[PDB]
């Protein structure tokens, strides 16, 4: 049998079976966590659709098979020694019959803590610690670069377009919020803090958008055409941030994510976009 993880008790983490310390064949069914596993040099043999559509992650998991959580046959045939899932998956019992499962409840641990937590689970403390130390220094330095342009008290709002809907996001639901609000310590407008931050996201009707945007808005979308009717509208064009050219449009296929690999890309992209806003 496998050498075992110490299986520390951590908020949001549930273990089904004896988790290996050094898994050799991991199936990641929670796109939130795939890039954490890759940062810790895990061999991923299965990943999901969102992972394959994230160009930053995809380059690192070319040999992994795309699977869904319902793919019991394909997952079995991949011969995993570990499956990682989100807590809202509904067939965890069946997955746990294939291999040991780590189930993670989103948001119980923050985007940085999740990495050090995996460091404890897999005895990869050194790799996690080095990444986190560098991240702390780099983000502080980049915070200074961007605030030199915007001022330190500029407000930012995180937004996403999905289907025909409009979402606002807080500091810990992806779409750049970890970068903007946690790493760069930008404030959000009061209405966003009051109405969005606690839930993490808020589906909004388009006509109230001006009320939630201050100095800057970051907008995630999967394709560049979705926002067209909004962007040309008198409503949108009336927003001061839009008039000032303080709109930063980002690609959701990577900006949905919160993992170290995706966030490295988001960090450089957002740094450059803020600097570029004053060209
Ligand atoms: Na998840
Ligand atoms: Na302001
Ligand atoms: Zn045992
Ligand atoms: Zn259900
Ligand atoms: Zn809708
Ligand atoms: Zn203009």
Automatic annotation (TrEMBL):
Chain sites annotated for binding Zn(2+) 8: 232
Binding site for Zn(2+) 9: 245
GO terms for biological process, alphabetical: iron coordination entity transport
Localization (cell): Cell envelope
Binding annotation for Zn(2+) 3: 90
Gene Ontology MF terms in the entry: metal ion binding
Binding site for Zn(2+) 6: 165
UniProt binding sites for Zn(2+) 10: 246, 278
Binding site for Zn(2+) 1: 18
Binding locations of Zn(2+) 7: 222
Binding site for Zn(2+) 5: 143, 185
Domain of life of the native organism: Bacteria
Similarity annotation: Belongs to the bacterial solute-binding protein 8 family.
Name this polypeptide is given: Iron-hydroxamate ABC transporter substrate-binding protein
Source species: Streptococcus pyogenes
């Amino acid at each position: 049998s496998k050498s075992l993880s110490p299986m520390p008790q951590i908020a949001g983490v549930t273990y089904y079976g004896d988790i290996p310390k050094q898994p050799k064949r991991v199936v990641s069914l929670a796109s939130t966590y795939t890039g954490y596993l890759k940062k810790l040099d895990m061999n991923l043999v299965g990943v999901t659709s969102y992972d394959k559509k994230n160009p930053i992650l995809a380059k690192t998991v070319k040999k992994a098979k795309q699977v869904a959580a319902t793919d019991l046959e394909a997952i079995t045939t991949l011969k995993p020694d570990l499956i990682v899932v989100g807590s809202t998956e509904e067939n965890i019992k069946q997955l746990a019959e294939i291999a040991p499962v780590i189930s993670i409840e989103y948001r119980k641990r923050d985007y940085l803590q999740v990495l050090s937590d995996f460091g404890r689970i897999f005895n990869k403390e050194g790799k996690a610690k080095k990444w986190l130390k560098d991240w702390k220094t780099k983000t502080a330095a980049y915070e200074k670069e961007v605030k030199a342009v915007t001022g330190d008290k500029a407000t930012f709002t995180i937004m996403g377009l999905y289907e025909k809907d409009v979402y606002l996001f807080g500091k810990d639901w992806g779409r750049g919020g970890e970068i903007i609000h946690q790493a760069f310590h930008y404030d959000a407008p009061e209405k966003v803090k009051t109405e969005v931050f606690k839930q993490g996201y808020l589906s909004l009707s388009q006509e109230v958008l001006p009320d939630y945007i201050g100095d800057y808005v970051v907008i995630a979308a999967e394709d560049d055409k979705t926002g067209s009717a909004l962007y040309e509208s008198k409503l949108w064009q009336s927003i001061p941030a839009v008039k000032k050219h303080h709109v930063i449009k980002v690609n959701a296929n990577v900006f949905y994510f919160t993992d170290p690999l995706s966030l490295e890309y988001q960090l450089e992209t957002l740094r450059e976009a803020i600097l570029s806003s004053e060209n």
